[model samples]
Target: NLSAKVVQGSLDSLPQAVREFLENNAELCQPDHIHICDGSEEENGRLLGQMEEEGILRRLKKYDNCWLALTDPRDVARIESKTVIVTQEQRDTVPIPKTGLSQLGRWMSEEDFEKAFNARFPGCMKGRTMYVIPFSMGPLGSPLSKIGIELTDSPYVVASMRIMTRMGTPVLEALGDGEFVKCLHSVGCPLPLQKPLVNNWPCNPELTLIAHLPDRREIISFGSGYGGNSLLGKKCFALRMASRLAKEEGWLAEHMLVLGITNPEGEKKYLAAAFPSACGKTNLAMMNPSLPGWKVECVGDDIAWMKFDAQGHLRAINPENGFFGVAPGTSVKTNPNAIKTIQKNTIFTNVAETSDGGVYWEGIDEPLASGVTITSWKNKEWSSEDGEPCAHPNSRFCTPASQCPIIDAAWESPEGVPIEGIIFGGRRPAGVPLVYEALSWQHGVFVGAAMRSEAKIIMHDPFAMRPFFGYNFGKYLAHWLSMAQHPAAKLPKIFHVNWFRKDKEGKFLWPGFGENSRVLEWMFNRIDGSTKLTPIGYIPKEDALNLKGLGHINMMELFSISKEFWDKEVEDIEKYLVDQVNADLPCEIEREILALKQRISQM
Candidate 1:
């Protein structure tokens, strides 16, 4: 009775099959009542310490009880192929489907997935501890937040979820009789009944199987236990699966960063930005404003959720409490606040170690620290001449957002902040303006939908440059249109931000990193209606830029719509939308594409 009382919730039992699987593994793994993690920082630390003692983690002495290295570093990146979206029907794979397509690789009809997963999940817990981390994606109990129960066999998942979400008893109390998503994950391999193979890493495909059922609001992920994949409550449940929930629920779940900016006039405004990976979204979220009297405050760096308030403004919240940042490119010159934040109570994976327990990734040091040795993911020591980097390219740091000095005081507010602008960004080495605003909401959606198409094939594409709306551009564009259509949604102004602009020799034109603040200043000025924009492009008034620090910036080419490539861009965009959407495309999208052709025709 006491054990039953200890682990209780609105829905105390899982599917019979799941119970059988766990019960069977209970014989193999053995444990303490399968504790429902209370989201206590102390417990999180205690378990992490236990993991360290077990040699599953290495604690960094330099920061506040920080951790460095993983049990296996080669298991670093989130494998997308192994990632799947479970659809009950093949038609469910399409955006508001009228028919089906060859998207079978990413979809698993429920009956089939359950059969494979049923066989796949049993005994998968093997010899590892199972943690049920109760977490809310946004601020707990906030209208923006969504609660989920994650059943994972890895302590590392427990540790990372503690930092990434509002996890623990408070979350369970909030789970009081309302809707909650059920998510289950495992490191995959089922340990043998006898002595296990000590040399082999856990799991196969040597990867993960990320599955979600939005209709049921449940998730099941197996195999690889890497950052994004094993952290099921995050990408699998948060943005990827939640995006579908948002569409049906009439809200917007975005792969965007939320931030509030303060100008010299003390005017404050929040922006939600969507950027492809490696686009410096995190750095921008933690920016130290380069201009006088300007301030940049972090809201949420990785993901955002926006909805309409009674007053009609589109309000947004940063759905995460921590930064799961790309470690290699971060440095003092780039994100000092992030560096300082990680100085205490953080988890570092696949990075080198200092004699003093500090960690080092490639960009952290100029030419490798004098006396330190690189710690390979395989837990070996070596140098660049030894072949591959010791730190995996996808190495990461998990730290609380509150750790950042620039964190906004209102980060925990249930109401969230009203978004005044939406910025769409991608890593375009050319053919994109450094900064520009769309003429209207439809145009803005077009800009978001039509970021340049890669001539090369996208592995998971119907050939339409994926990640336009982050995993399904057609559905994403339609979602945008739907959001804009809502009576309560006062869709914010939209702008495009591209920092990957390169010239003849591929050298960066705009000195990005901290200097991006200057561009933000111009954007804010435009939003404030203080600086008048040009007629054709909403280009900032020529005099608005404080170019004093910039000695070489071809102001002319940066703003050009590219006359040489203009005609082809229109066809490319048309083909992209037509090819992706296929049939019964939205009217507004058709009009939007026509509008784009006209916008370029006059020029």
Candidate 2:
């Protein structure tokens, strides 16, 4: 029965907590006006128009309803060093146990951050407008979805949230007298105390902080305006904060992608995968199958929230409404569906601007249309003679998932799609094979916990949630174990894959993109008992993968592993888990490690 009463900036009908928080922040920031977003087309147009008039957004002439924004160069990436976790000790309330705060950043006491908040957040919006945005992370009224109310001074954030989440009066109605996550943000660059206030891409890079109160389900971001920082609903609430709640409620909030595969008979199966950033996750989610008569459909490209259903199957839903995809390496050849999805009604950030009002980024694989002049991301005219590239490698396009040509019809099903398997991947130059299955659920959890990247220094990003895990890694691992042993459900099969295996010449051995679907097909086929057990888990025999149209490739090297490299890998995993992650590891994980050690000894 609740109706939105936000007309002309009225806050009369809001819940007391929402009203109090808004009033307190309003008094603190002292903004000229408090505008509540209703998530209407007219509201979107008005915000975009104001931003364009204020020189913060430029409408693309070639793309309908599309606009471009260039953030201050200093505020481009997430400030992980400054991201903090605050422990708010309250009466009769428990804090997140074993926060493992050392892994992400420093842990602060609530009083300490409140001191800093008062010092830095007050009067920060002195001459600007404050926007109160009510948003839902998943489908409204779906038990899996969560609500958040974000108070920000950046209209850019409001516009982006409109596309990235279900935002507006509907969220308010769903949140009637119910609890919601509290999200507060500011660009932290107050305008000068003068009659005419003016600033472009305002942000305080040095003083940036993305603070989270997991126990309280609150996020307070200051001094920067980046997607991961300002859009608190994405990583902060969706993964970090949601992970905390999932642990308490017996569900899973993972940094994973969900996709569906349809065979010749049109029977479809769903899978969820986890990969660290820049690891072809988006391309994999929206793949065009190279195998004949097979179809791949995107369910979600970024995050997946899963739980056991009444039918004793693990099911997952995509909590996000849009894709905030990286742009530099995306192309018609690499991801045609993504290219089509962003053709119109998109927001391109930090990408190159063309004289014809089109956007360009490196790795597009096609030359610019004739007569198009390019402007670099630095806002300078481009030249081939210049040493720097045209666009930021991290440039991005934010577009609705509905625009995706191959989005699954059931992508938004309230009960979610039943998952048949889970896949984990890492960028390894060598050592890891093209694909291998886990012996059991415990082994899969161990593999996920041991996931890492091969770099100048080995970087372990377990489950690709290194930065997003809400609490202790050990506790999180235990939660996975519990999920696996659900009385009514069977855990999905688990597999590991590596497409970045390189030859001695430094060229990738596996033909990636759609070709990776060949590996996916093999993994899915293994579900029907099609693989031969290797010293590792079930790995496909060299002849098992479909090699119909491919030229001669290095299958021997793609599936080969060195005992010496693995011996060292085992030792490193042990040290990383015992010394770095948790000294008292879960017994199941430790047993899996011991079993792996015995298998390596045999190898």
Candidate 3:
């Protein structure tokens, strides 16, 4: 039996609560199978020490085969687990009402089975698992079944509701039964049973995993009762699945490809990281440099699995999934290559509607113009039909990465460029400046918390409800900590950059988007190892103190200002290097840099 103790005060209360709830309900405690401690204080060292002094640890450790700590993803990596599995479970569940139209009923009832199976698998379900689970129906309390279409032989998983099953056989077959079960068990889900009352849900919530037996297909659905809730479930499921794959397969270390782009001079360089889910990865990876003769390649847009190599260098690998990007603002100017990559029949989700009552960019007929608003590309059906402006299961709008031009090259690349710097940034208030370096790993963590925006309650419920499960906050933090202490950590210099600030006249001025090209140029130029850190420029403190509305800040301005600071700092550092080496090379490099700076200043 794996006896567990909750060490953190925040976590300790859960085990007792669970035990009491189970006792009151007269539910059998499956002790041998799994014993969750609700991640209490006993699992944390502060409480663990107290428990140990009280002989609690001594008693618990005697019977416990494993000590499991349910923590944020960052903390998970720090934990020394002999058998470690990082999984995420949906936060909420909806009832599986007995209705002929319900996913559950369609799977369980013979009369509905024929229609439901055909709806999901048009070709036939000769050998597939036919399964249905309750899902949320938007804001309404109606229950819907999320179906899974599987195959008897294949390594694919496709998930959708009755309305979405009509997409075709390939879509259906992508949802595999084994994958669905794997996803469910990864989060410690139990078999489907009668829906529990809203108040008496399990301590660790369970997500619905439906298996289609005929084709061995599976579709994992969330929010079996409310529509808005299902969206959250889908996101949670995606994050969990991604994280699990990263951990089990060491995908981060194995698949990550780093390409260090350098100029002909081999003096200036910058590293780009590709992870498909938004927040500026693409913008950074494809940054156009100010220096001529510089080149850029897509590192990855969707997934990057990172791990420390035998020599303790952090290495990154690309995952097999194609990049899923937001399309409204993707244009030739901001992302020229990305726009060209969009093809006919590409799936664009969440774009705004056109004047003709059709969604914008339905088919990539016209070149996507630069400066398009993100809200313009938001899925209209989700907002207009469902009264939400976010994503939906059936809503699609832009090009899929598989058909994109740059995607092929990125995937085929064997090595990714080493990460030289780590920047943590987001939309920020006007007063915030472009960049600030963390003195140490602890300082970096503090900066992370301060820089993060206030958490919002996503009204649309998805699978993983716990706030901890959604973001890579825990794992990101753990990585920072490890880098701080490891001898060969090669921790990238950490910086914080915010572009959304304004002057008294209300003109957005902090970090200009046009300046991104300059920043990239400067980074590439430094690749030759001629640049010194101190000479990099710094944004005058006053410039960062005048901005407003963090959300509306411009990224270009941030990159621009950051480059200015980096260049000046590098020059200053070169002076010191010259003095120590007495090589006179610093003086010669300084002259060239001054000339370059003069040219950049004019632009």
Candidate 4:
């Protein structure tokens, strides 16, 4: 029997298990096929069966693969034939690799671990860094186990390990080793490790490391998570990689649109534009337009990978999970489809419930005797329900691509549409108008301020947003700088708008969310200098407000604010386009707007 001392370390010590597993199964743990599992007999069977059903076993059989099972001795006998189980005793005796420690300590200041990781992953050890701490809660009463696998900031390579809990405990004892390895395989680990490195790994793989631009050294690793924090870690890692790639690739066309408010006269437009994760990108993409005939499609809400096309014009593409959105004011009327999508088990997060057992906003809604009053948090005057906040961990507010309505075609697009304009926005006092044109890309970036604060303001505030990277604020800023400086940048026309800017009375200004659709339609109407209003040019605020059947004046207030912008910005953009871009632009813009309006009315 394997001694108890064999499985002494925590899951964080994956390096030990890797070394031991490799040593014990030199033939099995080869580059061809690796069988990773914890020492649980039941788990081995389940995992093996799942893999076989998924066709992994067939592939391994065709390759004449050997197995390296990271399981305790008690469960070793149950492993399939051709498998060599690395027992606690055997793993404890294997010599630790020189490079493994550095990888494990890449995030922490432990000198020894950092050195080990650097030695193992030489070229990948420098520059931007992300730390992935994989762990699992023990069955029922057992303590949590951590898998110790440190990946340096690299676009090309990855090395991970199972960490032990005690000096003699087998790496598999903590449950971290098996889980970590499983994550790797799920995200496409093996294909990338193949001798001739491949550019794109199969998405179905459980683990994957992709390097989009080697010169810029941008890399992204995807792995399975045991919980929310682990998943957040993966997202965080992806964001870092995206930031690096954005810097290296320079500015592509501005394919993304984030709208704020629209005007009633259909002249002015207010919009808030940003890259992924700053604010409102996903919100604007998935927002339900308040006007009839207006249509919206998600264009790379999270990850936008770009390249120049045959025409020598820059093009953008979204490469990521489904849209991550927040649905505070979503209802069956305003955003009926979004509500239905969420109800259908599409993953979302951070939505609250109502007193009547119906759903409402916890942070923004007030319980009424007969109706609901949902107020904006930025508006201090509106009173909200008092109680512990409630939101679904996986709700419409946050979601993965699998849960998105447009996931199927999101990444398949060759390149996103050319960006016509850019808008930067935030909440301010009500008196200030909702829009202002920014002079330059640097101005937009400076005003956007998409970095996390070093000082933690609110410890538990869920909406307290932060930049993607914490310690690397300078690097993140530099990325925008480089993009602005690039010769091919061709910065889009920038605008700044604040819907929350207070009027003289200090009361909050209400900007319509979907109302901006009309403003956009109005701009399109003038594409050919047509004075007629296209069917699509009308904002649907009235219909949306009525859909909820709410008699409250707040809904009308929102509509009016949106109408205000539509009257102002739409005319401004039209004048600019006619005066600057084309003397006689095509009249198709009006036709398109009309067609859009027709479609919305049908919906």
Alpha-carbon TM-score of each model against the true structure = 0.89, 0.95, 0.45, 0.43
For model 1, the local distance difference test gives 0.71
Q: How much does candidate 3 score in TM-score?
A: 0.45
Q: How much is the lDDT of residue 96 in candidate 1?
A: 37
> lDDT tens string, model 1, 489-554?
667988887777778798876887778888888887777664434322486666677776667888
Residues 38-62, candidate 2: write the lDDT tens digits.
Answer: 8999999999999899889898898
Q: For every model in order, what is the number of clashing pairs?
A: 5, 0, 142, 95
Instruction: Give the TM-score comparing model 4 with the true structure, all chains together.
Output: 0.43
Give lDDT per model, in order: 0.71, 0.84, 0.32, 0.32
Per-residue lDDT tens digits of candidate 4, residues 1-603? 112112222323445554443333222212232223343435334444544454332111211221111111121111111111121222111122222221000121234323432333322212222222232211111221123232222111111111111111233344433523222112222333433221221221222222111122222223221111123223332333334334444432222443323234543322325533223455555566666544555544443334434444334444333344445555554444455444421222223333332334533233455664422212122343644334422233333334445332433343443443554444433322344433345544433432111122311100111223211232333454455544555444544444444444766444445654543454333321223122212223333223332223343343233434444333433333233213122233333223333443553
What range of 10 consecutive residues in model 4 has the weakest lDDT sum? 159-168
Score candidate 3 by lDDT.
0.32
- Model 4, residue 155: distance off in Å is 26
Which residue segments of model 2 deviate by more than 4 Å?
Answer: 1-7, 88-101, 104-106, 193-199
Which is the leading candidate under lDDT?
A: 2
- Candidate 3, position 187, lDDT: 17
